[PDB]
Structure formats: structure tokens, C-alpha cells
């Protein structure tokens, strides 16, 4: 079962928030694809 990425804090850069969006999409892909 994949490791959930932590949301950045209040002071995050757009770089950190966009990186988070990609990590969250990767996590949710692993969650939804795992059983196949």
C-alpha cells in the first residue's frame, strides 16, 4: 500500500504545491490501480 504525501504548509512556494499535486496524483493512481 503506497505512502501518502503530506500537503505543504501555508508558506509553500508554487514549486512545492505543484510538486505536491503530482505526488498526490501518483499516490491516488497507486491506490486505485493496486488490486489489478
Amino acid at each position, epitope marked *: *500500500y*503506497p505512502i501518502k504525501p503530506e500537503a505543504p504548509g501555508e508558506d509553500a512556494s508554487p514549486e512545492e504545491l505543484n510538486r505536491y499535486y503530482a505526488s498526490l496524483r501518483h499516490y491516488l493512481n*497507486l491506490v*486505485t*490501480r*493496486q*488490486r*489489478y
Partner: antibody, heavy 111, light 108 residues
Framework: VQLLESGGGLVQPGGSLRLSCAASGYTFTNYWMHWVRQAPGKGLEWVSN????????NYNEKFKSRFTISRDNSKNTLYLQMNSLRAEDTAVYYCASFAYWGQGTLVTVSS | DIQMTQSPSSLSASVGDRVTITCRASGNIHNYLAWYQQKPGKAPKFLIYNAETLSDGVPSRFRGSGSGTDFALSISSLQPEDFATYYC?????????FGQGTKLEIKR
């Protein structure tokens, strides 16, 4: 991304074969890994699966007494250990994980 | 065990046709359904998972719908490479059983 199968071929009834499936291109713990077979001219039949993140296994109870699924995370390899093979086990055996299928290997069980 | 009933077992159709294959689970599988295409002497190809999600590189003319026990695969406009055998498979609880398959052949 590929699953590459090895180990099929001809075995006498009551004999043993080990199939293997080498995965490449992604983290080996991402997806459950399944074995599926297809007798000549027939449909797909689900055999077993393993979760490489924790070794959890499911078996088609039809094969539970005779077949053992395993993997080695340090080799990116899935195994199926088939004991006490019978003529009715003649089939193409596939490994499958998410969108990735092995090429299949023909296992013939005959005298 | 949950069994999958696929219909029809064979379909004669033409390039351009809209076609539908159905798959009914004997128990609730939520959306844990995959569709596969298989051609003679080839490994199955994974088309759709979670009932409706297209796998990478699969053409948009393939669509899946369903939830619970009632599922369907639709091809909006058959192309020559679409004549093949189709199977559904559930991933709810083991055994992860397949439909018995639909053979999609060319009408003449």
C-alpha cells in the same frame, strides 16, 4: 515497462514446474501480481495473486493444495510453483500486473 | 464466489458500427471490473479498469460503464483492429473470475 516470463514446457503427470515473471521499469511493490491461464481454445482462468508490499496471497481454491505463489522483491521476480501437475493443467500461463501482461508460456502435462 | 456473465457470446458487426457487450456480476463488485481484448495467439491486452477508466494508449472509441452488478463495454465506431475476443474480470474478492468472453467477428 515489461513482464518477461520463463519456465514453461513439457512435464509428466505428478511432476512439478516453477514459472517466473521478471518485472522492470517501476517500483515492484506498486501493484498486485496475478497468474492467469488459458487452456487451448478456452477462456481466461484466474489462478492466484500476491501483494509484493507485504506478501499477502489469494488463491483460486481449485489450486490451493498444489500451487504456491511467491516473489522476491530483491529480484523484481514473481514465481508460481506448480506441484502434482495433471493433463487438465495444460495451458498457456500468463503473469499480469495492472496493464502489464507477460507473453505467456505453454505448459503441457502429458505421458 | 462471484461469477461474471458476459453477453453476447458472439457478435457479427461491421467497421463503423456502434457495439455494446454486457457483463453482470452474481454479487456486488462496486467498480472493480477490468475489460480485456485478446487476438488469436496473443496475450490479453488491458483496456479498461475500475469499470470506466481507459488504460494508457487505448483509443477513446472504447468506453466502459457500470457499478454494483451491471457493466457494459461500448465501442462507438468499430475499426478493423477491433475484431477480437473481449473478456471482463472482477477484482472484488477472490476468485477474481473472468466472463466467458465475447467473440466480435466481421459480418458478410
Amino acid at each position: 515497462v515489461q513482464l518477461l516470463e520463463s519456465g514453461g514446457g513439457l512435464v509428466q503427470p505428478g511432476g512439478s514446474l516453477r514459472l517466473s515473471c521478471a518485472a522492470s521499469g517501476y517500483t515492484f511493490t506498486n501493484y498486485w501480481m496475478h497468474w492467469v491461464r488459458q487452456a487451448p481454445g478456452k477462456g481466461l482462468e484466474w489462478v492466484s495473486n500476491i501483494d509484493p508490499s507485504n506478501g499477502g496471497t489469494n488463491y483460486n481454491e481449485k489450486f490451493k493444495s498444489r500451487f504456491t505463489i511467491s516473489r522476491d522483491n530483491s529480484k523484481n521476480t514473481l514465481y508460481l510453483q506448480m506441484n502434482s501437475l495433471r493433463a487438465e493443467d495444460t495451458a498457456v500461463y500468463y503473469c499480469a500486473s495492472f496493464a502489464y501482461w507477460g507473453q505467456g508460456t505453454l505448459v503441457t502435462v502429458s505421458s | 464466489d462471484i461469477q461474471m456473465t458476459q453477453s453476447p457470446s458472439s457478435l457479427s458487426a461491421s467497421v463503423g458500427d456502434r457495439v455494446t457487450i454486457t457483463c453482470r456480476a452474481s454479487g456486488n463488485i462496486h467498480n472493480y471490473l477490468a475489460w480485456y481484448q485478446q487476438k488469436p495467439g496473443k496475450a490479453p491486452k488491458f483496456l479498461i479498469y475500475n469499470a470506466e477508466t481507459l488504460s494508457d494508449g487505448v483509443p477513446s472509441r472504447f468506453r466502459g460503464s457500470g457499478s454494483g452488478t451491471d457493466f457494459a463495454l461500448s465501442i462507438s465506431s468499430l475499426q478493423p483492429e477491433d475484431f477480437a475476443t473481449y473478456y471482463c474480470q472482477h477484482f472484488m474478492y477472490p476468485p477474481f473470475t473472468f466472463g466467458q468472453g465475447t467473440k466480435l467477428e466481421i459480418k458478410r
